[PDB]
Design a protein around this ligand. Structure first.
Ligand SMILES: [Zn+2]
Ligand SMILES: [Zn+2]
Ligand SMILES: [Zn+2]
Lengths: 159, 157, 157
């Protein structure tokens, strides 16, 4: 699926993505919200908080808000490898779940595979936010035991 | 046991418990302090930091500082299920331990049981702060390997 | 090996080590950087940030910047057991790794053994930063699953 562009303005880089980055990992998150990717991204690139992520994926589309080679503030590890070396993928509708959420997760498999090919990132480098800082994220995937199956789809699925 | 109420003023909900909450989990903590429940609560409901918990339990009493159906900021996972769907119980005197602490922990067993029955929360949904953010809390319970026994006490009587 | 001393001035204690401490644990970290122990410590004692560690160990020497019996802000657990009861050991050159790092690690095994017999800290009291707050540190050691072997070498020598 095509990843739509809806990037934050350069004048806000200092707040949303101040550093350049050489992607080495991909971090998967759950939004813990029930908003479409367009809403997640629009809010993220417009507010003034030092909080961001690279792409949001819902049941219908994938939207990029931060250049892949600039950092995002989403892993909670300060200037650690999560925030400074990983591209963050946000999966929408995880708050209430439902068909919309599982559709978004499966679309995220496709998004993650595109990023792996793009930056030559190995399957061992696809990580959970939890692995970087301890936060229970992706919450629904961890709660339902879906991470293992997700990794296998990313590793060799044809989507 | 009786859980006494000494709730934060409504005007501070924006800071201490900004969202309504449908309790789904109970999170157990250790204060890593040697102060009675009353002290813990007084400080928590008055300062202006976005840091809070629902009830503090010591060897003598249990004092609630935040409404059970409003979130508290105690699990370290920002706007995640920890802070937004769990009721936090702080067990006092864990710092130096001793009878005071073990007595408080037994009282916490009752408080957790009461909350479980109140909001129909299953035993598998009683969690450690560590499970939500990786923080080593409840520190004493983890250090002495008491979590399993605590859960069994809660599951029965 | 010999642990040099480049402690911070008493005036900077309120920020680098404002609390006395009775060492009970030893926390091993990775600098996630490629600077020598001299630079790490020097930089750490020059700025006035609420961030510090007790000793930095590279491939050549080991330098202490904070008194062993004073806390150091390095475990990210606020006033928790990691920051208030453990001595923090920073292993240099982990960013890019290389022989320099692996050499700094073995030296760190030495620094840890010395601190263990000096303050009678048991082997199961040697922890990672990750165990205190969930942060992925020591990143390289964890990334390469070198923790189990590290502890085994500390247990024997
Ligand atoms: Zn996340
Ligand atoms: Zn806690
Ligand atoms: Zn560390």
């Amino acid at each position: 699926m095509e990843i739509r562009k809806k990037l934050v303005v350069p004048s806000k880089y200092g707040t949303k993505c101040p550093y350049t980055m050489k992607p080495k990992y991909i971090t998967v998150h759950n939004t813990y919200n029930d908003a479409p990717a367009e809403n997640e991204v629009n809010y993220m690139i417009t507010n003034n908080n030092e909080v961001s992520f690279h792409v949001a994926v819902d049941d219908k589309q994938a939207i990029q808000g931060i250049p892949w080679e600039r950092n995002a503030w989403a892993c909670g590890d300060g200037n650690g490898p999560g925030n400074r070396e990983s591209i963050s993928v946000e999966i929408c509708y995880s708050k209430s779940g439902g068909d919309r959420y599982y559709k978004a997760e499966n679309n995220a498999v496709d998004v993650v595979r595109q990023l792996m090919s793009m930056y030559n990132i190995p399957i061992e480098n696809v990580r959970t936010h939890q692995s970087w800082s301890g936060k229970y994220c992706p919450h629904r995937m961890l709660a339902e035991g879906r991470w293992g199956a997700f990794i296998q789809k990313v590793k060799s699925g044809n989507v």
